[PDB]
Design a protein around this ligand. Structure first.
Ligand SMILES: COc1ccc2sc(NC(C)=O)nc2c1
Length: 342
């Protein structure tokens, strides 16, 4: 009943013991994160004299080979980030400790899902949203550098962490799934709530899919609730449809998974398959955001920066972020030139 000389468990994770000293450098504190890759522990670095976060990868090749890709991309971003300006988490260093690859990241604070849960999923200010929304568009602008051309492939509130708990400066984490621009190798990508139409429809994808995810996330930050909370892909696409309407024909004519959601009638047009949902395009984001009704649930009425003009700019930007066509969907650079930010 032993595995890796008593260091590992049956799940191939490391057994995190509190106060364990590592390599005469790192003092382990407590397990904080957990997932497919392995575990993530909080620890104190003796040399740099600071709190760091050591992402402990599982002791098997599947997870180890995926982690060295995460490293390869983390380091390549840190080469171009230099003066840490573009809101990418800093991979300080990495090493092997008892057959576990460990990635040492700067200690961040609470993620954006933690903020939602602390507001009982009522959301945060449009003004705080703007800050995250700008910082995120800069990060996506950074990832769109031709040399990088990095797609995160998994953006959501829990992969966006604040640097300091008192400040709104953010950092994006987890590039374990990060797709660097290429050919269509993968299909079932992104988390479901934030999964683009081109991914759902089984079409090619590029860096535009992170922009879609950003749109969903930004709306989720202000309302407090996921914009498209589908139980499955068909429900997911239906929830997108009832807000944004039927995807254009020219997109669906190419979509290999179009018949999973839509019918091609003899007419040649596209309509929904049967199954609870309002007609296409009727649950308008204007009504969801509460533009003319004092914000989400009328809770922002009277607050500064939450006027109809402020809500119109925010709504307009989100609609561009949620463009069905990935080619006309707003790019990071143009998104930052939007009124909402000025
Ligand atoms: C909570 O502090 C951190 C800092 C960097 C990373 S990187 C990482 N990896 C994940 C969340 O999959 N988690 C953290 C957590």
């Amino acid at each position: 009943k032993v595995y890796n000389d008593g260091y590992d468990d049956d799940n191939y994770d490391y057994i995190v013991k509190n106060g364990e000293k590592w390599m005469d450098r790192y003092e382990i504190d407590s397990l904080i994160g957990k997932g497919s890759f392995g575990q993530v522990v909080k620890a104190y670095d003796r040399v740099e004299q600071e709190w760091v976060a050591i992402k402990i990868i599982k002791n098997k090749k599947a997870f180890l080979n995926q982690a060295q890709i995460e490293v390869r991309l983390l380091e390549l971003m840190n080469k171009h980030d230099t003066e840490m300006k573009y809101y990418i988490v800093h991979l300080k260093r990495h090493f092997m400790f008892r057959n576990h690859l460990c990635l040492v990241f700067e200690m961040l604070s609470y993620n954006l899902y933690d903020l939602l849960r602390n507001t009982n999923f009522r959301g945060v200010s449009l003004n705080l949203t703007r800050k995250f929304a700008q910082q995120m568009c800069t990060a996506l602008l950074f990832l769109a550098t031709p040399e990088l051309s990095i797609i995160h492939c998994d953006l959501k509130p829990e992969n966006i962490l604040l640097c300091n708990p008192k400040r709104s400066a953010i950092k994006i984490v987890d590039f374990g799934s990060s797709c660097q621009l290429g050919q269509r190798i993968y299909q079932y990508i992104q988390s479901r709530f934030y999964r683009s139409p081109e991914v759902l429809l089984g079409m090619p994808y590029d860096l535009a899919i992170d922009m879609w995810s950003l749109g969903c996330i930004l709306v989720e930050m202000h309302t407090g609730e996921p914009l498209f909370s589908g139980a499955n892909e068909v429900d997911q696409m239906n929830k997108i449809v009832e807000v944004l309407g039927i995807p254009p024909a020219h997109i669906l004519d190419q979509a290999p998974k179009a018949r999973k959601f839509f019918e091609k009638l003899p007419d040649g047009t596209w309509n929904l398959k049967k199954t609870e949902y309002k007609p296409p395009g009727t649950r308008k984001l204007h009504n969801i955001l509460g533009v003319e009704t004092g914000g989400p649930g009328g809770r922002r009425a009277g607050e500064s920066g939450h006027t109809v003009a402020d809500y119109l700019k925010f709504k307009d930007l989100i609609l561009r972020m949620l463009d069905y066509d990935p080619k006309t969907r707003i790019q990071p650079y143009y998104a930052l030139q939007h009124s909402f930010f000025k």
